[PDB]
Amino acid sequence: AVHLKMMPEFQKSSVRIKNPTRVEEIICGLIKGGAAKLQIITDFDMTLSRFSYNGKRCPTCHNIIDNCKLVTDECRRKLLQLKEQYYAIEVDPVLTVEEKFPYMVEWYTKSHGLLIEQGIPKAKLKEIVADSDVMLKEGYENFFGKLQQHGIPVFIFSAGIGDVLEEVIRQAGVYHSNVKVVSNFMDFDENGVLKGFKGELIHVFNKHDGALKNTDYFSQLKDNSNIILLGDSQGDLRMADGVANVEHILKIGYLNDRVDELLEKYMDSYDIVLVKEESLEVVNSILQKTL
Amino acid sequence: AVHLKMMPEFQKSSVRIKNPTRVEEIICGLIKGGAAKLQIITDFDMTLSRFSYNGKRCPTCHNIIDNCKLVTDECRRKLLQLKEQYYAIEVDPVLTVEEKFPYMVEWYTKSHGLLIEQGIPKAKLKEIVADSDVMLKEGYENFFGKLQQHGIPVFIFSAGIGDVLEEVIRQAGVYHSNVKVVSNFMDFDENGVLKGFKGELIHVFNKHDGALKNTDYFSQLKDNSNIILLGDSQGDLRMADGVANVEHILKIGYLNDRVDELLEKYMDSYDIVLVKEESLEVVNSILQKTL
């Protein structure tokens, strides 16, 4: 049996669970399936990376570029201006999620276009990432390490910048063979300088689309019918939409922000909500029982 | 410029090179291309793993199973008998390489079939690999680590057993995201017990076939037109036959065995021959200049 009262990780004040009996039965399915049936599907920014440290706000992958030596103060201004106009739409309680889709597309397009203008070489991304303030959540070496040890598939599905994301995880020593990254990857010219972005835009609201466009990946894992999903938004709940078959799925959401406004929604929609929490210890503890 | 005389790794008595001026110009092409243009294509057994240690002969991936606790003394007797009869054909100087093809197919088929009979569970491969005497060549942590650091593609192309190979590299902590394994993978039944092998057999003589059947992989790496190839056989010289375009290719061959018989042949066909050598320091030194 699985008992949340007896897992110290589940006793933190940051752990919010609408339906503990349901959680216990899902975790029990995960335990019975073991390694052979498990796969992970996860967001990156604010999910595997920290939202804040030392009082201080931590960068998204996009912010890592926004804030680097290869970008003008003036470009950061315009980027900030974009964030202020478009974020107000992201968080507008009146528009439906489908009405926000055109606005999100324009935000990433406008802000990617501004970076493309700054002249960003592939060769410098190591340096930029190395001097950035990026932080992975506490317990990431254990998270990635247990999963590589048992060869658990990990599908990182991110609306960030893929080249940045991969450089963060590679420098942290956790970019193992079991980790597949699906993101917005940069397109470079003859001289290895950023000129555009590859494929179809991934943003916060269209992860359903990308999930279905990755049939290839998911069909190869037909037997991995037990899923743990991690995200930080409502949009992340779509990341498992392309999975061949589902026996048990556990959905864990980081609520980093807008706590009073979103808590009820997150509790209704994620199985486990993690309120202003900068570690992976609840997921690590589920893994410890499972693997 | 490149001078082999000024690289201490190239001064070992085990380093045999028919044509040093040509090697120098290939290494110079590699250096000019840097990380952006490089990819690695390599055998595993006796190439990344050692042929011998402490006087003692080291196991291939197949040997790891042959010799484990889940496999009988009588099974081993039959497997040894198979090795005797089919190895004599492998090393027969009168048959052509094409005439040996049917025999190789029979050998892998017969010896895999004997293992399938032993009842080998997926779950036990970790334990088996952990108590085996497998050894990676000296300098492998640096080999795999520089390559992951620079995100260099590594295509390990092995006639061994893929599940075994992958468990060796994962326990060694070197199975990074940059490493793709193409091998003979086990097919498991309902209970996670070996029942057969997936796809088309890879053996020592048909690596051309598998190299062309991996067009997907190679077309994604169109720009990685500089190749370092590593193997231990004549057959491994085909492992680059599927590469989109070739600008510079360096072929490095481990001659572990049959030294007097094969040396002239290896010297004529590999660029650098490494005679009874248990380390990756010559390749690591080329990487040091390149990356």
DSSP assignment string, chain A: ---GGG-GGGGSTTEE-S-HHHHHHHHHHHHHHTGGGEEEEE--TTTTB-SEETTEEPPPHHHHHHTSTTS-HHHHHHHHHHHHHHHHHHT-SSS-HHHHHHHHHHHHHHHHHHHHHT--BGGGHHHHHHTS---BPBTHHHHHHHHHHHT--EEEEEEEEHHHHHHHHHHTT--BTTEEEEEE-EEE-TTSBEEEE-SSPP-TT-HHHHHHTTHHHHHHTTT--EEEEEESSSGGGGTTTT-S--SEEEEEEEE-S-HHHHHHHHHHHSSEEEET--B-HHHHHHHHHH-
Query: Which residue, chain included where needed, has tokens 């795999």?
Result: B144
CA A52 to chain centre: 15
Tokens of A249: 């799925």
Rounded distance between C-alpha atoms, residue B75 and residue B65, angstroms: 11
The Cα–Cα gap between B65 and B168 comes to: 12
What is the C-alpha to C-alpha distance for residues A275 and B168, in angstroms, rounded to an integer? 40
Buried b (16+ CB within 10 A) or exposed e, A254-266: bbbeeeeebeeeb
Interface of A with B (CB under 8 A): 36, 122, 148-149, 151, 166, 170, 175-177, 179, 181, 192
A232 labeled binding residue: yes
Distance from the B4 Cα atom to the nearest Cα atom in chain A, whole angstroms: 28
The partner residue sitting opposite A170, judged by closest CB among B36, B151, B192, is B151
Q: According to the CATH classification, is domain A1-47+134-187+206-291 in 3.40.50.10790?
A: no
User: Cα separations (Å) of A74 from A67, A70, A79, A124?
Assistant: 11, 12, 9, 21
Q: Which of B59, B64, B51 is nearest to B137 (CA)?
A: B51
Q: Residue B163: closest CA among chain A residues belongs to which residue?
A: A151
| Cβ-nearest to A175 among B122, B170, B177 | B177
- Residue of B126, B176, B188, B223 to mutate when probing chain A, most A C-beta within 10 A: B176
Q: What does the DSSP assignment read for B178-209? A: TEEEEEE-EEE-TTSBEEEE-SS---TT-HHH
DSSP-assigned beta bridge partners for residue A186: A197
* Beta bridge partner(s), residue B176: A176
Q: What are the C-alpha distances in Å from A34 to residues A130, B74, B75? A: 36, 34, 31
A227 vs B200: CA distance, rounded Å: 31
Contacts of B85-94 spanning 24+ positions with Cβ under 8 A: B90/B204, B91/B258
Burial B208-226 (b: 16+ CB within 10 A, else e): ebbbeebeebbeebebbbb
- Put simply, the answer to whether A122 touches B36 (Cβ < 8 Å) is yes
Give the Cα separation of B170 and B154 in Å (integer). 15
Question: How does strand A52-53 pair with strand B248-255?
Answer: unpaired
* B268 SS3 class: helix
Distant-in-sequence, close-in-space partners of A221: CB < 8 Å, separation ≥ 6? A39, A153, A243, A244
Quote the CA–CA distance of B222 and B216 in Å, as a whole number: 11
Q: Which of B80, B38, B135, B91 is nearest to B235 (CA)?
A: B91
CA distances from B283 to B60, B183, B289 (A): 21, 23, 10
b vs e for B45-56, b when ≥16 Cβ sit within 10 Å of the residue's Cβ?
bbbbbbbeeeee
Structure tokens at A165: 């994301």
Residue with structure tokens 């380390």?
A: B279
Distance separating alpha carbons of residues A124 and A121, to the nearest angstrom: 6
Q: Preceding residues of all breaks in chain A (C to N beyond 2.5 angstroms)?
A: none
Taking CA atoms, what residue in B is nearest to A153? B177
- Architecture per CATH, B60-133: Orthogonal Bundle (1.10)
> Most B CBs within 10 Å: which of A171, A177, A193, as the mutation test of the B interface?
A177
List the one residue out of A39, A42, A175, A171 whose CA is nearest residue B177.
Answer: A175
Report the DSSP pairing between strands A186-188 and A194-197.
antiparallel
Closest CA relative to residue B161, chosen from B179, B138, B183: B183
Q: Give, in order, the Cα–Cα distances in Å from A172 to each of A59, A60, A123, A144, A287.
A: 16, 16, 18, 10, 21
Q: How far apart are CA B187 and CA B122, in angstroms?
A: 10
Contact B249, B231 (CB under 8 A): no
Contacts of A54 (CB under 8 A, 6+ apart): none
Distance CA A114, CA A78 (A): 8
| Residue range(s) of every CATH 1.10.150.340 domain in chain A | 60-133
Output the six-digit token pair for B71: 């496999």
Residues B192, A36: C-beta atoms closer than 8 Å: yes
What is the DSSP-derived secondary structure letter of residue B284? H
Give the whole-angstrom CA distance, residue B159 versus residue B185: 10
Residues of B in contact with A179 (CB under 8 A): 177
- Asked if A7 contacts A285 with a C-beta cutoff of 8 angstroms, the reply is yes
Which of B94, B93, B43 lies closest to B233 in space, CA to CA?
Answer: B43
Alpha-carbon span B152 to B144, nearest angstrom:
9
- Residue A21 burial (CB count, 10 A): 8
- Closest CB to B176: pick one of A149, A176, A181: A176
Q: How was this structure determined?
A: X-ray
Q: How open is the CA angle B86-B211-B26, to the nearest 5 degrees?
A: 105
- At B50 the three-state DSSP class reads coil
Q: Is B131 known to sit in a ligand binding site?
A: no
DSSP output for A95-124: S-HHHHHHHHHHHHHHHHHHHHHT--BGGG
Structure resolution in Å?
2.3
Nearest 5°: phi and psi at B53?
-155, 150
> CB atoms < 10 A from the CB of B167, how many?
23
Whole-angstrom distance, CA of residue B155 vs CA of residue A230 = 31
CA pair distance A224, A35, nearest whole angstrom: 9
Q: At what angle do helices B281-290 and B140-150 cross, to 10 degrees?
A: 20
Helices (H) and strands (E) in chain B, counts: 11, 11
Q: How far apart are CA A281 and CA A273, in angstroms?
A: 13
Residue B153 DSSP label: -
For chain A, give the number of residues.
291
Alpha carbon distances (Å) from A93 to A89, A235, B169: 9, 15, 50
Tell me the C-alpha distance between B275 and B33, whole Å.
29
Instruction: Retrieve residue A49's tokens.
Output: 């990376």
